[PDB]
Amino acid sequence: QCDVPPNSRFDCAPDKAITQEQCEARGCCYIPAKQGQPWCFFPPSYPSYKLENLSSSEMGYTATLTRTTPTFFPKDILTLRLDVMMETENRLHFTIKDPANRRYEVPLET
Amino acid sequence: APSPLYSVEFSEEPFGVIVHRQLDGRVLLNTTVAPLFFADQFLQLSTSLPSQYITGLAEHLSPLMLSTSWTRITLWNRDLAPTPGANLYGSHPFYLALEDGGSAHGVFLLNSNAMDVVLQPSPALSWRSTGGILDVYIFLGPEPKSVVQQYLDVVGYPFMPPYWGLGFHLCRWGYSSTAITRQVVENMTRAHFPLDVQWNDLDYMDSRRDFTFNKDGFRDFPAMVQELHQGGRRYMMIVDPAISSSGPAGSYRPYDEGLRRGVFITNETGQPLIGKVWPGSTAFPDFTNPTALAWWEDMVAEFHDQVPFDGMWIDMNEPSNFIRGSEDGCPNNELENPPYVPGVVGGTLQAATICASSHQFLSTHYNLHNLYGLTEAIASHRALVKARGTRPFVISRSTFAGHGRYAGHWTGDVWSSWEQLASSVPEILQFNLLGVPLVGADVCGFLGNTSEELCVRWTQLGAFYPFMRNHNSLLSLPQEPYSFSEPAQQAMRKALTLRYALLPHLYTLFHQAHVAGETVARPLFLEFPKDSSTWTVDHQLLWGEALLITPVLQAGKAEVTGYFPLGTWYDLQTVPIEALGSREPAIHSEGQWVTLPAPLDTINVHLRAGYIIPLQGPGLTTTESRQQPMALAVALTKGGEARGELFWDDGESLEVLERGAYTQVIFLARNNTIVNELVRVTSEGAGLQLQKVTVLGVATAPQQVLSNGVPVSNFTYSPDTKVLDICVSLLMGEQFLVSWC
Numbered sequence: 001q002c003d004v005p006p007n008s009r010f011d012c013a014p015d016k017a018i019t020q021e022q023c024e025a026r027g028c029c030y031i032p033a034k035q036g037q038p039w040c041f042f043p044p045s046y047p048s049y050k051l052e053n054l055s056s057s058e059m060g061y062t063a064t065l066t067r068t069t070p071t072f073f074p075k076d077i078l079t080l081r082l083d084v085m086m087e088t089e090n091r092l093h094f095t096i097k098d099p100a101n102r103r104y105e106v107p108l109e110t
Numbered sequence: 111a112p113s114p115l116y117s118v119e120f121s122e123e124p125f126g127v128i129v130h131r132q133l134d135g136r137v138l139l140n141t142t143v144a145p146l147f148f149a150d151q152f153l154q155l156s157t158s159l160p161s162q163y164i165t166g167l168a169e170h171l172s173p174l175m176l177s178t179s180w181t182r183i184t185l186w187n188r189d190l191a192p193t194p195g196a197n198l199y200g201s202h203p204f205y206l207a208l209e210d211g212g213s214a215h216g217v218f219l220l221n222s223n224a225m226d227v228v229l230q231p232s233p234a235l236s237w238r239s240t241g242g243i244l245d246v247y248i249f250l251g252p253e254p255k256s257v258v259q260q261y262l263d264v265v266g267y268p269f270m271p272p273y274w275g276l277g278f279h280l281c282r283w284g285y286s287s288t289a290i291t292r293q294v295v296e297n298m299t300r301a302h303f304p305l306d307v308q309w310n311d312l313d314y315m316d317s318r319r320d321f322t323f324n325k326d327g328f329r330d331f332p333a334m335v336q337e338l339h340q341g342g343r344r345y346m347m348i349v350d351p352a353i354s355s356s357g358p359a360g361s362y363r364p365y366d367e368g369l370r371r372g373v374f375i376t377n378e379t380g381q382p383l384i385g386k387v388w389p390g391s392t393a394f395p396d397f398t399n400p401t402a403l404a405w406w407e408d409m410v411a412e413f414h415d416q417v418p419f420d421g422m423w424i425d426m427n428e429p430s431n432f433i434r435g436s437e438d439g440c441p442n443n444e445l446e447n448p449p450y451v452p453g454v455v456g457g458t459l460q461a462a463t464i465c466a467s468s469h470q471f472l473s474t475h476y477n478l479h480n481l482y483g484l485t486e487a488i489a490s491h492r493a494l495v496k497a498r499g500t501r502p503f504v505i506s507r508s509t510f511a512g513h514g515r516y517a518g519h520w521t522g523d524v525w526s527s528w529e530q531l532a533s534s535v536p537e538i539l540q541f542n543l544l545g546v547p548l549v550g551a552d553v554c555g556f557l558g559n560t561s562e563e564l565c566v567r568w569t570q571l572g573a574f575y576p577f578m579r580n581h582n583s584l585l586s587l588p589q590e591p592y593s594f595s596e597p598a599q600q601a602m603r604k605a606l607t608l609r610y611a612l613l614p615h616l617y618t619l620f621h622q623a624h625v626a627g628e629t630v631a632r633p634l635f636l637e638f639p640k641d642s643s644t645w646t647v648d649h650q651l652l653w654g655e656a657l658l659i660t661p662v663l664q665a666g667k668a669e670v671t672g673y674f675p676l677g678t679w680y681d682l683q684t685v686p687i688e689a690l691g692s693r694e695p696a697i698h699s700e701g702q703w704v705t706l707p708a709p710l711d712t713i714n715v716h717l718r719a720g721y722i723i724p725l726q727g728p729g730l731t732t733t734e735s736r737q738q739p740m741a742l743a744v745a746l747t748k749g750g751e752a753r754g755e756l757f758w759d760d761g762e763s764l765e766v767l768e769r770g771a772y773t774q775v776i777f778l779a780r781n782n783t784i785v786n787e788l789v790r791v792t793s794e795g796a797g798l799q800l801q802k803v804t805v806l807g808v809a810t811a812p813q814q815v816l817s818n819g820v821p822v823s824n825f826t827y828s829p830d831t832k833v834l835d836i837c838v839s840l841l842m843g844e845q846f847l848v849s850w851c
């Protein structure tokens with residue numbers, strides 16, 4: 001579960017200085033670097049979102065994403081909508097949004 | 111065969127998007143590598159990268175190719191003199207990733223929130239944003255040039271500058287009267303230095319306020335600018351975003367009218383947020399408010415009725431604040447004190463700017479901060495179109511993705527140091543990849559005192575910046591070209607002469623940027639991606655496909671070592687150029703490093719075999735140079751072939767391409783002949799005279815040279831250099847045939 005090559009470790013404490021005990025309580029792996037590389041990092045089993053109800057559209061795909069276990073950040077959005085748009089032969093476009101609330105989007109012309 | 115270049119699949123648990131290149135099966139994106147985080151103020155999406163080679167994520171002082179050794183890149187627009195490891199004036203959440211063999215793809219995260227991008231050596235990347243949504247574009251290329259074009263199809267093709275904007279610009283903080291400003295033009299002219307655009311910094315203002323001029327040093331400001339126009343020059347001046355809030359009510363129209371129309375960013379109680387900048391207490395226009403755009407258009411048009419300036423230099427538009435947040439501090443809320451603070455200088459989103467929870471028309475400043483500069487550039491582009499009725503010229507410090515559709519950029523408060531001269535090449539190349547081709551650094555440097563040797567090398571390299579301005583800080587020693595020793599002046603005058611001769615070519619490169627999303631200044635890897643030796647080259651640049659520039663970037667050097675991709679590269683010193691004032695001819699490369707002589711009076715420039723460059727005769731302004739006869743430089747392949755083009759219009763009108771108000775000509779060399787192909791001929795370009803054709807790589811002396819079947823008045827052949835120089839009397843707009851045998 002914690003046998004992750006050093007260069008492939010993703011930081012499980014990007015927010016604060018963490019102790020081993022606090023790292024393990026988040027469900028993360030604690031392995032000091034040998035001399036940067038994060039000491040606290042995600043095991044492959046760290047809770048993410050699950051894909052559900054993947055559906056085909058004329059433009060591409062839509063799905064629901066569901067998180068069952070909260071993260072260490074406040075106000076996780078536990079239900080997300082995925083939209084995948086095959087716009088041109090050279091351009092792929094996907095969005096992940098909160099289907100229950102309009103969130104800020106950068107103004108952009110079509 | 112009809113199919114996308116990409117294939118897409120999904121991991122169910124944990125969730126991930128997987129994007130393959132169809133042609134070779136290469137995994138370009140794989141978000142399964144790390145958990146998806148999506149909280150109100152924290153988004154994280156990770157991917158594998160296909161190689162250790164990645165560029166983009168401006169604005170930072172770094173090599174063109176970013177370090178994957180546990181690097182944290184912060185996007186939060188900030189007023190800071192360029193220095194490594196810091197968030198600087200702009201934010202461009204786009205990368206281009208190279209793939210083994212020379213294919214590439216691009217990724218754009220359309221998100222304007224404060225963010226960290228973390229690169230690790232697996233190799234992998236994590237986007238960490240403080241708000242908004244995940245809105246991701248993948249561009250399949252496969253050529254690096256095609257990735258850039260595909261990105262610019264989404265964010266906008268670069269704007270077409272006026273021809274005069276490609277001339278030399280001269281500015282300093284400290285030209286404290288119209289008498290002094292006029293002496294700069296007189297001193298440049300007397301020493302035969304081209305100068306298209308005279309600038310002023312904040313010296314012109316009355317008590318440091320926008321849309322005023324003082325009645326001491328600048329009493330006759332309107333007359334000074336009218337006189338520049340009579341001599342064939344243009345005028346630029348600084349405009350800051352912040353508006354003095356302290357003056358008596360009714361005494362300062364920009365504030366009085368701004369208040370009436372509700373144009374300003376507001377605070378929790380609904381009043382204008384008050385910061386501190388040059389005037390003292392100031393309000394900040396909200397350029398997301400349609401009414402603020404109307405007010406800005408009115409202020410610019412009214413000021414232009416007093417002083418007919420030709421463009422706007424928008425500085426301090428991060429927005430920059432001399433104090434933290436506001437005169438009244440910032441409230442304690444989750445926008446001012448968010449659960450994840452990216453690696454910003456000062457450790458707070460408020461440092462050197464305004465409160466994050468302040469109110470704009472579209473959203474909070476928290477969400478819109480990284481667009482502030484861009485929204486001011488859009489407002490100013492529109493204001494200048496309405497005030498002048500010709501192409502706008504906006505140069506902006508702060509930028510976001512899509513900036514290049516509206517304005518240009520300069521790299522800010524760079525030190526007068528050899529390190530910052532060297533660092534300017536990667537930064538100018540990076541902004542070209544990001545669709546901001548009208549970019550440059552302050553020639554000779556801004557902060558501190560330049561040296562004569564540094565200012566010679568900086569002018570040599572700076573003559574190849576698409577935007578070329580010498581600008582200088584208030585407390586610095588003078589660095590105008592006429593302020594140096596005679597030998598230094600000769601070297602600087604040669605650099606400006608060569609840039610002016612190449613302006614028809616540089617203008618055609620901007621035309622290709624504007625119509626096809628091409629780069630103007632481009633790294634060697636964009637042109638020769640299948641040669642992996644080019645991937646780490648960022649101290650050389652190309653203009654387009656054909657002109658390779660290898661500058662000296664260190665003190666005390668009389669040579670430089672540069673990379674030459676496989677091919678023949680002709681020394682541009684073998685092409686004759688006329689100047690108003692006072693070595694192998696060809697490199698045959700297999701793809702190798704070559705040491706070149708580079709004495710102080712020299713910058714190495716080579717022309718790629720198979721290309722034709724249009725050139726124009728000399729002038730101290732583009733008003734003069736544009737009336738001169740033209741010349742061609744024809745670089746033959748071993749097989750006797752070459753191709754080039756010329757785009758010509760009136761140099762400043764709007765809607766030229768839509769109205770067809772241009773001339774476009776292709777030049778072709780084949781079998782000891784040069785011809786033109788007329789793509790479009792109109793009244794603009796009809797009178798263009800071709801008086802000189804220089805052919806490089808002519809292996810044997812010709813016995814006859816003909817123009818339209820008749821022996822030419824004169825030609826010279828140099829057996830040492832293999833150059834054929836031909837005098838002709840032709841018109842770019844009428845079919846000709848030049849031949850030799």
Ligand SMILES: *[C@@H]1O[C@H](CO)[C@@H](O[C@@H]2O[C@H](CO)[C@@H](O[C@@H]3O[C@H](CO)[C@@H](O)[C@H](O)[C@@H]3O)[C@H](O)[C@H]2NC(C)=O)[C@H](O)[C@H]1NC(C)=O
Binds near residue numbers: 381438439
């Ligand atoms: C929102 O912005 C407004 C400005 O548009 C802020 O108004 C400022 O409010 C402070 C007090 O909270 C005023 O300071 C006071 O000045 C008077 C006399 O000048 C002095 O007697 C008091 O002791 C105090 O220093 C300040 O004058 C006023 N500024 C202006 C230009 O009117 C307001 O505080 C801001 N609201 C928040 C919540 O930040």
Ligand SMILES: *[C@@H]1O[C@H](CO[C@@H]2O[C@@H](C)[C@@H](O)[C@@H](O)[C@@H]2O)[C@@H](O[C@@H]2O[C@H](CO)[C@@H](O)[C@H](O)[C@H]2NC(C)=O)[C@H](O)[C@H]1NC(C)=O
Binds near residue numbers: 052053064066
């Ligand atoms: C995944 O989808 C199922 C089915 O949803 C239905 O069919 C879809 C195509 C769409 O048209 C929906 O509007 C339909 O409701 C969801 O399971 C259903 O959940 C609803 C509401 O709780 C319930 O009334 C139904 O009985 C369920 N139907 C079945 C067949 O189980 C499911 O909730 C979706 N999953 C997620 C995580 O959103």
Ligand SMILES: *[C@H]1[C@H](O)[C@@H](O)[C@H](O)[C@@H](CO)[C@@H]1NCCCCCCCCn1cc(CCCCN)nn1
Binds near residue numbers: 348388390507
């Ligand atoms: C923008 C650009 O970068 C340059 O090219 C221009 O030449 C500059 C002038 O227009 C410009 N940057 C100017 C930066 C000025 C730095 C001032 C530092 C402020 C420190 N300060 C002020 C205060 C009190 C508020 C006083 C309000 N007048 N406290 N600390």
Ligand SMILES: *[C@@H]1O[C@H](CO)[C@@H](O[C@@H]2O[C@H](CO)[C@@H](O)[C@H](O)[C@H]2NC(C)=O)[C@H](O)[C@H]1NC(C)=O
Binds near residue numbers: 140
């Ligand atoms: C995308 O990345 C994921 C996660 O790194 C890869 O999935 C892992 O592959 C390893 C090695 O084959 C397996 O032993 C693990 O069980 C996989 N993890 C998960 C969560 O499935 C996956 O191979 C990558 N996909 C592609 C096509 O490269």
Ligand SMILES: *[C@@H]1O[C@H](CO)[C@@H](O[C@@H]2O[C@H](CO)[C@@H](O)[C@H](O)[C@H]2NC(C)=O)[C@H](O)[C@H]1NC(C)=O
Binds near residue numbers: 290291294297590
């Ligand atoms: C323009 O050039 C003139 C002439 O060189 C400069 O005026 C001289 O400046 C020196 C200082 O280095 C004075 O001691 C001399 O008295 C000046 N000579 C004359 C003839 O007036 C002038 O400073 C230059 N102006 C600018 C703005 O560069």
Ligand SMILES: *[C@@H]1O[C@H](CO)[C@@H](O)[C@H](O)[C@H]1NC(C)=O
Binds near residue numbers: 558559585
């Ligand atoms: C620039 O030169 C001036 C004049 O000698 C001097 O006062 C100033 O300190 C110099 N600045 C730097 C950074 O060396």
Ligand SMILES: [Cl-]
Binds near residue numbers: 018020
């Ligand atoms: Cl510990």
Ligand SMILES: [Cl-]
Binds near residue numbers: 022026072
């Ligand atoms: Cl915790």
Ligand SMILES: [Cl-]
Binds near residue numbers: 073074075076
């Ligand atoms: Cl919570």
Ligand SMILES: [Cl-]
Binds near residue numbers: 175177
């Ligand atoms: Cl690298």
Ligand SMILES: [Cl-]
Binds near residue numbers: 133252
């Ligand atoms: Cl291919």
Ligand SMILES: [Cl-]
Binds near residue numbers: 471472
């Ligand atoms: Cl709204």
Ligand SMILES: [Cl-]
Binds near residue numbers: 103104472473474477
């Ligand atoms: Cl919002």
Ligand SMILES: [Cl-]
Binds near residue numbers: 643
């Ligand atoms: Cl090599």
Ligand SMILES: [Cl-]
Binds near residue numbers: 703
């Ligand atoms: Cl080397």
Ligand SMILES: [Cl-]
Binds near residue numbers: 839840841844
């Ligand atoms: Cl003719």
